[PDB]
Design a binder for this molecule. Structure first.
Ligand SMILES: O=c1ccn([C@@H]2O[C@H](COP(=O)(O)O)[C@@H](O)[C@H]2O)c(=O)[nH]1
Ligand SMILES: O=c1ccn([C@@H]2O[C@H](COP(=O)(O)O)[C@@H](O)[C@H]2O)c(=O)[nH]1
Ligand SMILES: O=c1ccn([C@@H]2O[C@H](COP(=O)(O)O)[C@@H](O)[C@H]2O)c(=O)[nH]1
Ligand SMILES: O=c1ccn([C@@H]2O[C@H](COP(=O)(O)O)[C@@H](O)[C@H]2O)c(=O)[nH]1
Ligand SMILES: O=c1ccn([C@@H]2O[C@H](COP(=O)(O)O)[C@@H](O)[C@H]2O)c(=O)[nH]1
Lengths: 348, 348, 348, 348, 348
């Protein structure tokens, strides 16, 4: 007895779809789902997706409510579709994937990932669910996460954090650290050695190393002195330069965090999705310095220092590829006379 | 178990709601309901009501598919709601009544007409359905139709025609002639003597008496002579006067029918609902004669002749009351020197 | 360079997309596309699909404007997608296929049908377009039409009619008769022997054999006598029985055509798509006889006579399979004492 | 001269409907009302209700702007409709009641509450308005609030707080403490002895007793020691248990307030309306502990202590009914060996 | 190659329209623009204007991204339209002006401001753009801003602050202080001597003089003593009176700022646009004091003191006109016995 009214019954009574029997009366108006409570309509769901309102509602109700990989990781690994779950993209307020497998009769392309239609697609498999490791072994294309070893398969250790109901966190009551595995055209594929972004935000930014603690606490000249960063242009890249009409540098989230605590600024997120590199149209409220495309990455400051200090500074300009969140991020490196002028990640 | 997808299943497989088990995939977009058939969306219902699309869809699917009284009759008798059915108003493409009894969870005010909330409402009961005659005997306010006698109740003979799936017809394979009964505050009413409108349309107008055959076949002066109608202004009232910029008369549907077969004209139906008197903004294509409010009634011509020949003609102008379709219709009667000048029904 | 404004320019100047350079100003509102002509907005396209309005507009403008197979034929042959064209489904006012190849950036899954993603799909190829016969020879799954012989392939002769801009016709100035070929998993199929429906309509029904001329001209008993059809229940199946509240029979379009020219009736097309068998909720205006699901097929009368005269009549009821428009249509055959009682196609 | 343009004139000039004469030009687009100011459109109202945009606008403009009972109190007392005012529900951004009396021609069921249609409805009456106490005495069903005694009527003292323009507050410049009276089927009905919720929110939470001050200030073990709460499971019920994947307890708002000041968490309000018990899908950001249905009530901590300490702890599990905000709230009581395991309110 | 897809390419790649070549696929659904990124739709723009979605998107993408005059200044100077730019109104989330010149083919009334259609309109010209000073000299009606002197033209020094991407700021890395010039019917027009509002907001309010520092820091009686404000009713006008049900005074933003830091309140901005005087429906959360129309102006406190101390206090009531932001603001002045009772700006 699968139906719109049953999905709404579960939302009202269990907070999400829980397979319980029951029905409530529902009204659909434009892109919103309502239910009647004691004679009046109460909004249950406002559709912000490009799917029909009643379909989006069901996929949202059926969203995965355990820690799952952040969407940027799944995108970077080429995931097209999930096996028997919905990965909800809270940055876009929409399903991470257009089609489903065994979830919803309007969006399903199959009931099980073993069906031939799924073979060309990179299917996401969750080893925490019974049977899905074995489905991955039979799939032609897929990405698998597990909490432990899988016999014979060589793992890649994933990021420490995961997404739980749209909250990115490092789990203490739950496990958010997964092993990752990937298959392409029937062959298990070695995942590259990689850095991971830290998935923090401006307001609640917390340092995760003594170097980041020092960066937030010390003055610019003292931090650069203590960590021996002369000639690496941190004044520009990390602290940002607000003296000209065009804003200089400011490409590390921690540097935005330091500035924000002292002086507010505006960030227009003109491509609002989850991605390893984020691009903002930034306007500094105190000075009027601004920049249309300011690429910002949230690396651990120790990792960025490691990355920049390993570069050859003898070329005027080159593109440097660094593996981050399993993808190749291009950095622009500008040097003059053996010193860095700038070093910044580019719009993906 | 009631459900949007089950309603759609019945529409696709049975043509309407038939209580069958099953489900089909449904999409709701732009006030329209779609179902997926072999990978593509097929429109099942476009909402033209002021109700939510999924609610209107369910009421439409649950519409009564037997011959039922035309909505104008039910309105004239003061019907507020129907017992355990939906009277679909095909002139408005919407339910004839705002609420339901035992039909739909979003619109129901009760499951049975015996509930207290129904006592003050005038409930429509259908004697063809088992138990409904006795429900009428117990109800405080109600209208009852039957096909035959009811013990201890005097009937009022209704019109010959009824509505079947939006087609108004005099039934030959099905009975469309009902007895009518009405109760107000527990008291059986004596319904008034009444004429009935004939519910015909322009393009397929069919005469229903020898006088109407003669009207369509004969020239104007031949007809007026044969039925001795000199001095009743039929030339104006029934045939129409297209000689001046304002169109004179033309208040009987048969007169429009006669003109239409020879010469086309435009009728703007600016209040599009079912009613005993209809008002049109008429523009005559041949002459350019037009009129903003032309009230038009489809009485059998013999009945209209009886009415106008039964009036006193000694006063310049007065209001004449005629019970038609059980309601009192006001006509304006204008006379000069003992003859009719015009006689027309008024917008109710 | 593809563009909304360039699509509109072609529609305004060429009647459809013709690859011409230019732009016009465009407004998008209420699922409708407008263009500005001398200071006022003129509607160019109203979206009736479940796609975004600007995407539906582009696919409509790029529709195939040569004679093409009717959508029911393509559906019956399992076609999923078209090579480098859009088959517009005029019954649904929408694209016949969800995805495209080399047509439109929002809906394309590939630029050429040789890409790997197309291998499992049944691709429609048009031998009138240069190169497409050879694309079919290399494709894994496909349907091919041609106007003449293809070296080394046995053809299946298709119907006489095809669809040109939504008009189904037997071409006189253009060829509408195609050879058909089909491949499944790289293997050329032998297409089955099949009847074809005639794709006619009620108001303009034209007989296509002497038997059909006789059916329309002669009275019922004269016709049944002349073609010796006693005992095949044509009175019920083809002519229809309007004597009871439920309408009996009336399963052949020619029988509806004959009734319609004498007496009007209403057909509610409750699944409005192109299909070999059509299902209507029918209400006869003269009698009030009606039926919720009346399955109707337009076979040449001679073909229907051959089919029913080729059945064993010794069992009360059974399912009869008839290949029509390349698909297996199930008919219900009911018999009594060695004669037909009824014989009707089922909702597919 | 009541009209859309006059309602907008009052909104623009007086901040709400004030019965002033005048008109401004208005544009309606989708669900939004605009007015022209110096050549450009300015948004006056965005419709979030299920009513037509222009109707919702008028009811909003006509909202009651004096302190009124919170909607949860009116709901708990069975109020269906208000006499000659609109109680705006700021939690739902919509009218608290679907119909009106003497407010708006699209929603009125009557002009005065004495009309027979209002007799079955529980009408809300405001003794601050001239004549409404006497209307309550004549009403068959109703709820009355006053600021002082009504002769012969036995009062119930209401909550200290009321809602003023969506701000819940205990009035100092205005009176927010009302006497309550209720009638059912013509008979005055004794309102039950009741606790009241405190209607506070997480961010601005202020303690209202020394015990609440101590709870916010002291550590868990010290507070439980000082107020002798051993064996009543406050560690679970009030402080919450974040050590397992499922979040334990956390059912009092003050406990959420204490946690929030130290560590943020996410509350999905999946039924967003005013109610005595609120239910949240909660995710703790620090630990990853979460729970789909966490029922939360804002009682004065002294009241909850009084409630739980009066319970019999000798049964493994029972349902305990407590009157709160005039309604029966069900609590689940789990005990083991004479101590509380948990005690929590259930989803209404 | 100007098109919807090209506008979207620029937004995605450059943060705004930058005249770059390229295209991305775009979906329009209701009032929102999406683009496809790696198989899924990402929202680029939600239309809150009364223009068609695709037009509003292009004007937004083409918005001026240098410091520009606040919209209230342009409105006060009678500006109808801008020369070859779009002034985006971030308070209304819409273009400041309905038509354009050389921006967008759907909204342009001309390509250049020299065209005859522009002569009756007050065109905004930006002396920072090559050629626009000379266009102003040739225009019949216009407003010009420059950073420096224009030969022979007598300047008006504008406000210190300007709007950069919706951020109002006094520029340090950029110039926000302009000279202003205006022409009416071909004649340069002397701009009046004027005060300027300070364009601050409640949360981030920063004092801009020692008097404002003292007002925020000192107690009411001490501030009034130090600055000799006895008899000017500052207790009412600036500090506000919260003792009665109607809120008294509170007409200077700095006084709202002082109250807000101590006790929160609600401001309903019922005409949400940029204007020299703002009007709020205010509800004080601590007391319940409220007022439907509370007019609030953000003058430097020193300027307001200068204004009020120059008034003649010998009349019971008069209207006082003060030039502010180049417009005449009407103040109500009430006096009794040579002292101010109140002095407040009126709804523009
Ligand atoms: O993808 C990009 C392109 C540019 N920039 C910023 O914009 C500046 C100027 O870019 P360009 O004009 O040299 O391309 C760069 O130095 C850098 O700060 C980014 O952050 N990301
Ligand atoms: O309800 C109305 C009012 C007017 N008329 C037509 O309009 C003419 C002029 O009406 P009046 O302008 O004299 O009211 C009438 O003679 C009659 O033909 C109607 O048909 N119905
Ligand atoms: O798919 C169907 C089912 C039924 N019928 C019509 O409805 C009658 C009654 O069907 P049933 O109620 O016996 O299934 C049949 O004899 C036939 O005329 C159809 O045309 N198509
Ligand atoms: O209406 C409900 C149901 C459950 N719970 C919480 O969920 C836990 C587990 O519920 P159940 O799985 O025992 O029903 C309860 O102990 C309680 O913390 C609520 O807060 N409210
Ligand atoms: O445009 C207006 C009108 C009134 N008021 C406030 O409302 C009070 C009462 O206004 P009235 O009822 O005297 O018009 C005024 O003293 C003033 O505080 C304003 O702020 N702005």
């Amino acid at each position: 007895n699968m139906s719109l009214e049953n999905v709404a019954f579960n939302v009202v009574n269990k907070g999400h779809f829980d397979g319980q029997q029951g029905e409530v009366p529902v009204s659909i108006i434009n892109n919103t789902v309502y239910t009647k409570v004691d004679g009046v309509d109460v909004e249950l769901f406002e559709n912000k997706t490009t799917l029909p309102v009643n379909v989006a509602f069901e996929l949202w109700a059926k969203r995965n409510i355990k820690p799952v990989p952040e969407v940027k990781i799944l995108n970077n690994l080429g995931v097209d579709i999930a096996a028997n779950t919905v990965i909800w993209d809270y940055k876009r307020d929409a399903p991470a994937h257009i089609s489903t497998i065994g979830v919803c009769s309007m969006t399903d392309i199959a009931k099980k990932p073993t069906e031939t239609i799924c073979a060309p697609l990179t299917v996401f498999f969750d080893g925490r669910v019974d049977g899905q490791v074995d489905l991955f072994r039979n799939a032609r294309n897929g990405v698998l996460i597990t909490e432990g070893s899988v016999k014979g398969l060589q793992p890649s250790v994933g990021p420490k954090q995961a997404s739980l109901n749209g909250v990115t966190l490092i789990g203490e009551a739950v496990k958010t650290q997964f092993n990752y595995y990937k298959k392409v055209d029937g062959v298990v594929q070695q995942l590259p050695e990689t850095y991971f972004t830290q998935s923090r935000n401006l307001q609640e930014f917390k340092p995760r190393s003594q170097m980041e603690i020092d960066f937030l606490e010390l003055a610019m000249d003292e931090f650069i002195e203590r960590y021996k960063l002369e000639g690496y242009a941190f004044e520009h890249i990390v602290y940002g330069d607000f003296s000209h009409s065009q804003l200089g540098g400011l490409h590390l989230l921690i540097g935005l965090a330091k500035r924000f605590k002292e002086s507010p600024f505006e960030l227009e997120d003109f491509i609002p999705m989850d991605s390893t590199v984020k691009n903002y149209f930034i306007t500094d409220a105190q000075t009027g310095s601004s920049k249309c495309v300011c690429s910002v990455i949230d690396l651990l400051l120790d990792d960025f220092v490691e990355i920049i200090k390993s570069q050859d500074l003898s070329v005027v300009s080159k593109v440097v590829k660094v593996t981050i969140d399993y993808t190749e991020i291009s950095f622009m490196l500008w040097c003059k006379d053996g010193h860095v002028e700038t070093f910044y990640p580019k719009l993906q």
